[PDB]
Design a protein around this ligand. Sequence first.
Ligand SMILES: CC(=O)SCCNC(=O)CCNC(=O)[C@H](O)C(C)(C)COP(=O)(O)OP(=O)(O)OC[C@H]1O[C@@H](n2cnc3c(N)ncnc32)[C@H](O)[C@@H]1OP(=O)(O)O
Ligand SMILES: Nc1ncnc2c1ncn2[C@@H]1O[C@H](COP(=O)(O)OP(=O)(O)O)[C@@H](O)[C@H]1O
Ligand SMILES: [Zn+2]
Ligand SMILES: [Zn+2]
Lengths: 380, 665, 190
Amino acid sequence: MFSKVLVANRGEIAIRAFRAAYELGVGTVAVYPYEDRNSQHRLKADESYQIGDIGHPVHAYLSVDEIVATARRAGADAIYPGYGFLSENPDLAAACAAAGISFVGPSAEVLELAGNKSRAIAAAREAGLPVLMSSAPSASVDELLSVAAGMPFPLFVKAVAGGGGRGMRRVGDIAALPEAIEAASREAESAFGDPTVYLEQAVINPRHIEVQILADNLGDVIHLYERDCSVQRRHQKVIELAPAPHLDAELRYKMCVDAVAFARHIGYSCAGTVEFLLDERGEYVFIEMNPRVQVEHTVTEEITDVDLVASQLRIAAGETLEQLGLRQEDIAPHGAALQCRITTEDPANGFRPDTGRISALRTAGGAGVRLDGSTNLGAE
Amino acid sequence: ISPYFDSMLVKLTCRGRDLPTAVSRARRAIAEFRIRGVSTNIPFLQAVLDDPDFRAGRVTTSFIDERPQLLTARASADRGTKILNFLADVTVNNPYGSRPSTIYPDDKLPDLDLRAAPPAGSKQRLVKLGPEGFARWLRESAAVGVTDTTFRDAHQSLLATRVRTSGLSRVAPYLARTMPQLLSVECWGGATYDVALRFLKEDPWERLATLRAAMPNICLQMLLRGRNTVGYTPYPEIVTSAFVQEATATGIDIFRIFDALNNIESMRPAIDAVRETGSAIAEVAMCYTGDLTDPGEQLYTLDYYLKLAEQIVDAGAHVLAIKDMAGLLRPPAAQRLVSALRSRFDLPVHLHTHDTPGGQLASYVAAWHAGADAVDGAAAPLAGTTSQPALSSIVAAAAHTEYDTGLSLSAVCALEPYWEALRKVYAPFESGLPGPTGRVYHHEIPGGQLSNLRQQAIALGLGDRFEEIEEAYAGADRVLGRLVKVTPTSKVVGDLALALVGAGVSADEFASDPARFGIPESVLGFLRGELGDPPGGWPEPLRTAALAGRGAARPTAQLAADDEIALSSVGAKRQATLNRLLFPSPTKEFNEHREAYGDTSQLSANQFFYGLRQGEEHRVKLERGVELLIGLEAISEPDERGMRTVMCILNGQLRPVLVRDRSIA
Amino acid sequence: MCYTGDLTDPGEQLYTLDYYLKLAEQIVDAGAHVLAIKDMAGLLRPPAAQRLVSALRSRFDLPVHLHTHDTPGGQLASYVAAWHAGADAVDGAAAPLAGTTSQPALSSIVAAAAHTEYDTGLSLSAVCALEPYWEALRKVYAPFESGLPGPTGRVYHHEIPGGQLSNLRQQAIALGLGDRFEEIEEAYAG
Ligand SMILES: CC(=O)SCCNC(=O)CCNC(=O)[C@H](O)C(C)(C)COP(=O)(O)OP(=O)(O)OC[C@H]1O[C@@H](n2cnc3c(N)ncnc32)[C@H](O)[C@@H]1OP(=O)(O)O
Ligand SMILES: Nc1ncnc2c1ncn2[C@@H]1O[C@H](COP(=O)(O)OP(=O)(O)O)[C@@H](O)[C@H]1O
Ligand SMILES: [Zn+2]
Ligand SMILES: [Zn+2]
């Protein structure tokens, strides 16, 4: 396997990667800015190095050349993105290919397909999935109305670069469509720099369904059943859910089947997920496909008892899903599970974060309890 | 922990698809867990989890029959806890009182790209041509080679040889990359060995290795003292040969060899050992005393030095040097001596002197105008008084002349603020004189001893008047008949002046009743004749018959066969055996300290000597990529015992340490 | 005549030998009994001094007086290069109050010419016998001490008279920035 691996991330995901690497007997290297010298992940690795200048701690992690140079100096063989930061930036994959360092990810070509959006949709019409109406991305209001004159209303006007639930508006008619579209364009331009907003048919009372896909290099795709993320606050994920209750078996079977067909058609080589929305009458919409690992994978890890990060690392080393034992006749969920996240947001004054020094910490545990990420007394 | 119930701390359960996965997960869990404060049975569990039979599943009631599972030892080798213990002990029990704001010299270093390889220097040339070719090149070169003595001979005469390795190692790369034209650097030997073993708890060999790695393009020079290498007593030949071999192996390029009383057969084995290596340079030095230009100088005349030099050349010397330790060489003496030496022989000449009377650079200017090839220089913030002449003056005195050294003057000036800050840090150990003294012409004393003499006369009685020690040193020197002292015969005369002033002997009645005094044993050992013979002659036609009927001389035990066995191989074992054979008691103290408190040679002067303060954060480098961040939080007043609790911060985590306050007893 | 710069340097286009030579010619035209050179910062090197003294002694017929300070250290060499070429008189401060920003020691000056054709004729024991009184007097004047730690190389860039440097150090201790003294050096340079 790999002799050494560098993790270009921060937080609990770095510690999870370190634990997975230690389970596989692989050395670990960490990089930190000056302002984050007191983080725990610095002391959990075999070697640590400082990157960036004396300012802009966030920009330090978004520097491909510096990380590549540090990995080359430390004699690393692989780079693990994690989630966030440069986890979906094709420049990192190109730079890794330009050197002798391997990149833990699907492929360089797959990363280009998932960024601009709606060419995923072009790939979904071709692969033959249930797909929704897609609007032409345009920052102009007259053009958007000329396309909107033939729509089933109401309509969601969504930022083109918007992702997560940041920058969409529901309009019940076309009379208020132009002001709404102008506001959305201004917000998208101020947020992500692209003033283009696209419309979409607004499906009533939806439920959000996630399907996890695992695939190796030579080509073999398996699914790890569904999840549920219906509980959201301002379109942000709040509480995770076990396999989705009140769901018939035919529904889940055909979701898994067309998800796996799309994944096989798309030429995937790593872990990832596909998203669907299900309505009162029941239909599949294929919102998008996230080509990385989220913070909710642990939930499926509790039902299918299959390791994700270690399997990902072994797949990046050139192993198929045959010596790993991940074949689809012994994978069956048993039990239910759920996950929650604890933050410093105050539910009293807005929801803004609060900063301070921790003066008391008491954890918990027992039967059926798993904890990820842990601070210490006196931390800032 | 409550001594009433069971010792149960935590139950850990690990699960998996199969047994090997659960075992790997348990191994990772038990490795990540950290408990400090009490002794834990973690290593036994780790040994049990790493048994191939246990992984295979051949479990049986008699699984424990295998013995070495129990005593696997290697508990933790915890370095952070020992560093914290030592730091807390220093903080609570610091002998030095209050202090000004902390000074950081590292902020004064100039900006420079420490990534590019340094340009080739004298080590490349010495490797390419060898010793003979290097000597010929130095003789035939119109430039005058400058040697740097800031690392050894500067803080020895001003700061009691108490500068640690951190500052030298921090400043060596800049010296190697702004000044690639220095002939050699003196950074080892003399009194640094004993002080490093005794007062600083460091290993000199590690210092030599660090300095070698730091500077790869400049030769390194070491001051050997003939039979007594770094000690104060004669040593057997095998020890000296082993020491030369180890030192040339670690990276010592040049050996400067002298003797207290200038005579051959006391330095021949060292010269032969240096010449046997085939990659080192031997520089034999003649000690200078008196004033030969004086009409009435009937003992230390030009012919004496000329025959000394003839013998040295017959003995196979690669470089010939003149050693002035008190600053008694005048421009005309130096001119005539250098001219005669250069015209009689065909060897390069090295000049070394101290600046006690002031303005000794003139001597250098008179020497290189007549044939001198190389000179020595100390950096300006640590120059003058009892130290060596400034380097900037030496570089500026030959600029735009046919004797140009080629050293940039801006580059040499750019490093002064760091030396200033470093000297400001070493405030409690300051021993420099007010300025230049004229009196040295009457009571000639080496510059390195005068500071300790001033401190001894401050702290051991008469301190308001210092004359008595001066004319007492003069009288003691005249009694033994004009001795040539540097290290060995300096301390005997110092002790004799001490006893003379303490016994009321004005100037001469000591030679009347020697048997009615408490003469120091170093003086009897001088009179016995193990340091050789005096140049002028034995001063005892009436002093003592043989020894004044004291007794006999103590025997010497032969080395044990295992030591001779270990002296033949190269490695850390030979270095440890030399350390124990040279200075037993301080190396045993150093070994105990290193066992107790790990490795503390990576600390700075401020942490090592003072301790920890509140509001500041310290970075201590353990390994490449392994660094520790240490700070302080609070201190509690002592309980009914003498015990206090100090709350500190390590890697952003709170740590209580229990310490003993020896002040309240 | 006041000395500044380094005339032995190839790029010295202002304070050259000819400038000093015409200065001295004017001084001699003005009716001077003794001609002297004043060095207040210690910027006179052995070779500059040799050439200047030789030219002055060969062009004119006046005695030459040399005065200098010991700020860079080891300025006695300049004296030794001057009296070897024609210089008639030198200056000296007593050893307990010499060095640093003061004038070169008197004992060194007397010992550098003993048993030579340039002998001054001053007893060295007599000059050495008066040092303890000067030491005690300097110990008495403790509150008004303003001497530097030692010799400084930097004077070649920020040339300042020795008599002013002490007050400058005290002013920068007592009027703000005292931990870092560089800024005053390059500000004087600017
Ligand atoms: C899967 C995992 O995350 S755990 C597998 C085990 N390895 C690790 O934990 C990775 C880093 N840990 C270490 O380096 C540990 O010191 C070990 C387990 C390798 C060895 O421990 P020991 O031999 O008992 O102690 P050691 O002499 O190394 O002490 C080193 C000290 O520096 C700290 N340290 C170790 N590595 C680093 C680092 N990269 N940066 C900063 N501090 C570090 C350690 O925490 C320890 O302080 P502590 O007293 O709080 O433990
Ligand atoms: N008409 C709509 N169709 C689909 N998603 C919608 C619609 N209106 C609002 N949304 C919200 O937009 C989000 C779609 O996911 P997206 O914005 O791509 O985020 P992510 O990439 O994190 O999954 C969900 O939060 C969903 O509830
Ligand atoms: Zn010396
Ligand atoms: Zn003046």
